[PDB]
Amino acid sequence: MPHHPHWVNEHLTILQFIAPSNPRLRFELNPAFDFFVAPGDVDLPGPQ
Amino acid sequence: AIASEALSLLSNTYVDGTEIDSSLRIRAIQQMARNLRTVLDSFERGTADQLLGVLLEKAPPLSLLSPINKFQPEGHLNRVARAALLSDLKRRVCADMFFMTRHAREPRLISAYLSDMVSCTQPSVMVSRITHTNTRGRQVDGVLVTTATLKRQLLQGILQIDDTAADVPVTYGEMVLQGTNLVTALVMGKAVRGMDDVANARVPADLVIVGDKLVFLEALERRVYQATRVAYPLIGNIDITFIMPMGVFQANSMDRYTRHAGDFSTVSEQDPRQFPPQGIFFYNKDGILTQLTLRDAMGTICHSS
Amino acid sequence: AIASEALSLLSNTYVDGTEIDSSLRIRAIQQMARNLRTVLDSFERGTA
Amino acid sequence: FFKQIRSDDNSLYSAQFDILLGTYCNTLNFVRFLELGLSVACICTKFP
Amino acid sequence: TTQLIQQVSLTDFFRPDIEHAGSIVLILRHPSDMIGEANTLTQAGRDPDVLLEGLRNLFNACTAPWTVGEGGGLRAYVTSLSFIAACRAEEYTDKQAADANRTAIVSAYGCSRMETRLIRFSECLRAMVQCHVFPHRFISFFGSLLEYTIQDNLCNITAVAKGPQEAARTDKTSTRRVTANIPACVFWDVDKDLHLSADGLKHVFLVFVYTQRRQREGVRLHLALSQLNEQCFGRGIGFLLGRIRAENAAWGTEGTRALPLVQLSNDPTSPRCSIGEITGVNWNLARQRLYQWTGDFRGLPTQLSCMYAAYTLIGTIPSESVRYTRRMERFGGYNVPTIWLEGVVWGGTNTWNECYY
Amino acid sequence: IAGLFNIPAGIIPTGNVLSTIEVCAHRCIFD
Amino acid sequence: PFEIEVLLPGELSPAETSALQKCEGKIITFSTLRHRASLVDIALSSYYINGAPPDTLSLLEAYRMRFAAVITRVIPGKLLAHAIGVGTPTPGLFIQNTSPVDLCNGDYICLLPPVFGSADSIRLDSVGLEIVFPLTIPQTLMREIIAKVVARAVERTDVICYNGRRYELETNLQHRDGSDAAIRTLVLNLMFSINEGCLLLLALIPTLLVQGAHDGYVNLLIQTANCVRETGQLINIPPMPRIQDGHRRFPIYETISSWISTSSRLGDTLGTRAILRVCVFDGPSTVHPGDRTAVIQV
Amino acid sequence: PFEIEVLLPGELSPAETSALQKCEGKIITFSTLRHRASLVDIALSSYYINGAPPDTLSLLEAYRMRFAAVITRVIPGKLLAHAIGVGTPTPGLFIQNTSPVDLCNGDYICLLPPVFGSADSIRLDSVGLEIVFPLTIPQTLMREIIAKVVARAVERTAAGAQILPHEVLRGADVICYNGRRYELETNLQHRDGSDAAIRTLVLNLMFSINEGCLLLLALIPTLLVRFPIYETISSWISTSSRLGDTLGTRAILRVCVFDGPSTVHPGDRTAVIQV
Amino acid sequence: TGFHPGIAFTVVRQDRFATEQLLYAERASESYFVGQIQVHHHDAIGGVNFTLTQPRAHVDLGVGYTAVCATAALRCPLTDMGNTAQNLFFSRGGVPMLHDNVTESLRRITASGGRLNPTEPLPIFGGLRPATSAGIARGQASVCEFVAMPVSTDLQYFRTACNPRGRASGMLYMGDRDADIEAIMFDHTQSDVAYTDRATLNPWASQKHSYGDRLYNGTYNLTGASPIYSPCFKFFTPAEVNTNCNTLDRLLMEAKAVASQSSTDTEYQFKRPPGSTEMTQDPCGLFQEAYPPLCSSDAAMLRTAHAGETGADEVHLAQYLIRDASPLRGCLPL
Amino acid sequence: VAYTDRATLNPWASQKHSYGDRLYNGTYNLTGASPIYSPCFKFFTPAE
Amino acid sequence: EAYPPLCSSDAAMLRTAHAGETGADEVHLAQYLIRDASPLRGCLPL
């Protein structure tokens, strides 16, 4: 775990979620989808 | 400014006589004349900007000068009278900020204020041979310089015009040192004017009668400051401070009351208006609601200072 | 020797004509005359 | 340019031209300090 | 359009009688500053007073030897370029031109106490470059000689400061104009070594090549004339002097484990020394080892012990396609090959650029 | 510093001044 | 006053002559100075090194070697221009701003190739050449650009904030002959800044870290630095040797002086040198891109 | 010829006027050139930054961006000056020696903020400002002067930082010129400007140099027989380059003496030529 | 997280408005002397630049005041009454924290949730200017300065023209000696001047070396490197003065439209640019007072449900609503 | 710009490729075959 | 920009029982009523 996850800080209010300092703001585009980042060129499930 | 080819064509000193440059020389001379005729009038115009701008640093505010001029028992006052007068000064300054905007409907407060402003200053020396006068012969007293908007607002129904033309001197009245004045300024280093001790033009200009005096009214924006790159004075700025508490909590049981029974009912069991507040609400420049919470103070309280 | 100000008072080339400087120009050309009359005689005396 | 017409073609009778319909300028009147009503606020004089 | 500089001085290094009008004249700083600089800049281990021995004998063989120490204004201020050219004539490449100028300056001068003076000056410079007291900060530059007046052993000379060369009036010679004259030994143009076109404007520089070895040091003086840029001259000179540069880098100084900082900082689990112990209460058991490094570097070539040249801009020549002329004419009672430069504008501040590479 | 000219300096006055009021009440404008 | 006359080629199209009249106060370079010259020298084709258009590192070396000239009033036939480098009086000299950054009074001007977006330059189809004009920025911005370009060079073998505005650089390093040459001149300056006195200055790190706290100013010095902050808490620095002749010598004097001359040479050999100073009489205090200012020869 | 006129203020004490008459040939440094200027640009008030009075490192940067001038003559109601700037052909340009070292012919002039002792200056208590004049030293001595002053300050920090001082030494530092010694800062006490104006100067010098023979020792470990590693390089180049432009050496005048005394002492005035 | 600690704040803001003025003058108010013009040949960029110059002299012939000025009407406001906090991270000099990650995270968290912040690279040897944003919306933003105070503080004090220092000061309370401006600015051995029943309002920003006074005083120079303007500076600087005439004359002379202390080009209200010469009238600065605008701790009690005028309740249960008492009452549309 | 305290009001129709932007931009041509007018069109086109 | 017309999430709070003007309350319990701020204020009879 090099950094901290971005899906675990759900205590933010609407103001803090909207403010430009929110790093996960750019990935909130569609209300029916979730845009995340994942290592490319791998198959799920994969190795241990 | 003068251009290089223009000066080269002018410095020929009769080394020419063709037909093409006979026009270029004429046009260069015409350009020089056109530029000089305006450079000269620039000084006549800037005289009136040097004036009207030498006086803004001498004129103090009317809201302060008028009650000081009303209260003159002996000039010097005791501490009690000074404090009583400072309270009135504060009160007057807090209220009489914008006359033409607040009392824009009522047109007699404006005339009263104008009369008070006129009868507030003191006259000066009167030595003169010819001075500005109307067609009848009455002498003028002061000048009211303003913007065209305020001029129109005053001339519509507040003030009354007395005359449209006036007589004005046309002489400068030079002076020079000669005679025994030159010899005493070289061997001693002093001089005195005189040194003889033995012991009109009809010009259109608006004139109004405010109070009991006859004053000139000027709103120069087209004769001067028109189509130039300088700004018009009398458009100054006023700075004002505002102060607001954020999270005060009245720690008492007699002031945490309500003025009616069902003031702001709520379906919840705990009324969320007994807890201490955190932010403050007010209006923006354009009437938008804004909010200043405690979190916004995180830049001055969380410092190493 | 000739001072700097006295030099500029003569290199003006008729850019003046008021009253007080006309005297400064007079005492300027007088110092040159009083000085030049001595340096010339200085050679005459220097021969001996 | 090598223009070769077969025999009495077009573009031999069209007289296209530009035309100038005149020019204009301003006047730029002047103003004196004494004609202004402000001159009754001070007593000016000359002093060389 | 031009300005002049006057100065009176003793005539033991300069003779405005024999020197041609238009030659280069240089001046010297007070010799008392040499010892104050040597005893503080001398390399460790070397003797610092050999310069004093070499300097005292110089004035011992010079007139008025009891006038050193006060600097009242009556010392040997100025000197000539041919003087140094003859003092170091045994080092220039043009063998015959060097020795001809040497004998000429010996004969035209007193010729009695002149040879001794020359050898004293020779080892004087040799000891100058022995303790890093390099003689490029003590030799300034004056313009070409224009007028002079002397009565005995003391002369008042005036020279141009900056501007066109033929804009003055010497007013006592045949013509009222003079041109720059230099001995053919010092002249050395670099563009004809570097093989580039010689057209347009060209700058003038003076260089001071240094050789540093054990009991064998040398110092020449070359007047370079090149079209190369103001700073690019340094890179150009190194290509021709690549030998002496490498010789000095190995024979300049004649009088230990690494540490993997980036390695042990890229990897964790190394002995840390957080600020909590450097606060200053027990800052010895906190830093007990933390490393050892057993490190020290005392004897290494400094940038001052590997210097081999020092140049300075003097003037330019605006006329393209210069046509400098070389010929032999009488100098006193002997003939010497001189090069004649025409139309050279003097100028430029006296700043020395040192080529240590 | 001032006072180089005589303060009274009785001569023909240039012109008469008006508004005879208490001038000692404000003397900061004066030199 | 020295000027050079550039003979424009004949048979020029009227559109190009007008575009050439737009370039009133720009800067051009010359390989050899002469009163009469040709248009081939000013053309970028003259900058070619082997057979190809030059590189940004090769351009930095051509700028030092070549002479500098300033364009002035251009007539239909001739193209007047004055010299800069050689000492020559020029009354009323002016330059047109070509950099996207603003200039003010008392700024030294440098000269670097176009590192930002595609250089605006006049192109001549009939003649077949094109002329690229160099870019002029102040000294402070100059040293920052060189620092990042050299660092990127070592990487192979960017954002700059000015006046609260960020920019980018598209450096070009398609050649290799010039890239390794900058590495040589760099390490040669670091190697000549090492004398017997580093040991003392390298032993003052702990007291520097102590002085870092309760000062509120050295911290900013410490944060920008990386080495001394890391070595301060990782190395022991054996205590001290002695001096060979300490009775008459000062060892820390050279190192504090040997570095002074080295640092001054660093800013010039790595890039270019200051060429001009801007000082306008009776003009605005800040100039905007595209406007002209009166500058003084350095 | 371009000349600047400094308006003398009214109601000035005669003592302050007489002292202004003394500083005839001294150097004034103007921010923006204009034929008419005010004393506020001359006083030290215009020199200080961030509210606090200016620093030696700040003064060095001030002398480069700011333009210099030279007073020519004072008048009981006016003050004149000439510029050493663009192209002015100033006739009869003479300056007064302000440094304790002597000057000779053919010596170029540089400038320096006062470092040796307390700077002398005229102080106008009535108006409430003072005017500080810069130091005028030759070129060859300038590079040595700076290196000696900074090296003196580091010695003081070492004697304080090290638990024991390494006192054994050669005696007292001294600058010799024309057979005259200056013997600066004899006593250890009286730390007047030790860390008062050269404090920040030593700091920036103590960091770039420390980064100098450390980066090489951390990049090529062959010399002696998570980590950026590139941003440190770019930061070192940007700093060392700026610091070098700071401690520059550019001559401003040349002492060209005709029919006069060659050597000149502190307090004398000589005619100088514009370089 | 929203937990309320035991402290309250007072925010101070400053705005500027462009107004129209009206000036009156007497007949013989000044004597004007004009000299003769001079010509100055001078080289130019391409040609020649002639310069004409003429000197003049002016003397007021007043045995009193012969000129008056009054701000009559009001034009559009220039600045904006927004909510832009002041970042104290633009300064350097104070004693920092021992651990550098602590202060790094502190600065990062302070920058998060704000508008103006120092650039991240944090350039050494610079000015630490904020990043230039894009186009502006409705005028230049104005900063707000916060001052801490005890929670249970008199709320009635903020309903009139109060003073942010907590204790009335100024040179307007004198009469016998000169060493009294210093007496009534910090001496808490005697009662306040205005409210003669207590020393001060908040004992944290009114003493000689209290927290607020140490923050900004002018003689301590804590924010010298900060390029942003500080409106609470004038209420804390002692503003020395001498005695030459009576207090009435001193007051009448102080109001002379002193120079500005801001900028009219930027959008962040930076410090006054050195060299810019524009004169603005500064009331309520020579009196050391501030006007409270229409504010309310709650938003519901701000507007009544009648499609018109706004509500004016004082306190509902524990909230409050301060009625506007500023000179700008019949302006600023709602 | 208008409210200098937040990035957007809704983060679903204001990004470069948000849902509301992808629905209609004028440069993506999603409703080209639709003959009905769309009023919200003029608010999402870059409008060069 | 766009102008919001007279709308409300509820129909009861739209009209008052006074035989005349319409109601203009803001929020009753959880609903809302936006007051009209469109240029068409003195037209479109009700």
Numbering used by the authors:
A (entry chain R): 531 to 578
B (entry chain P): 146 to 344, 377 to 482
C (entry chain J): 146 to 193
D (entry chain P): 50 to 97
E (entry chain i): 118 to 372, 382 to 483
F (entry chain J): 19 to 49
G (entry chain g): 4 to 160, 176 to 316
H (entry chain h): 4 to 228, 267 to 316
Lines from the paper:
VZV belongs to the Alphaherpesvirinae subfamily of Herpesviridae, a group of enveloped double-stranded DNA (dsDNA) viruses. The highly organized dsDNA genome is enclosed in an icosahedral capsid shell comprised by multiple viral proteins, which protects the viral genome from being exposed to the extracellular environment or detected by immune sensors in the cytosol. In the replication process, the viral capsid plays a central role in maintaining viral genome integrity and enabling virion assembly in a highly regulated manner. Similar to other herpesvirus capsids, the VZV capsid is composed mainly of four types of protein that are arranged in icosahedral symmetry with a triangulation (T) number of 16, including the major capsid protein (MCP), the small capsid protein (SCP), and the Tri1 and Tri2 proteins that make up the heterotriplex.
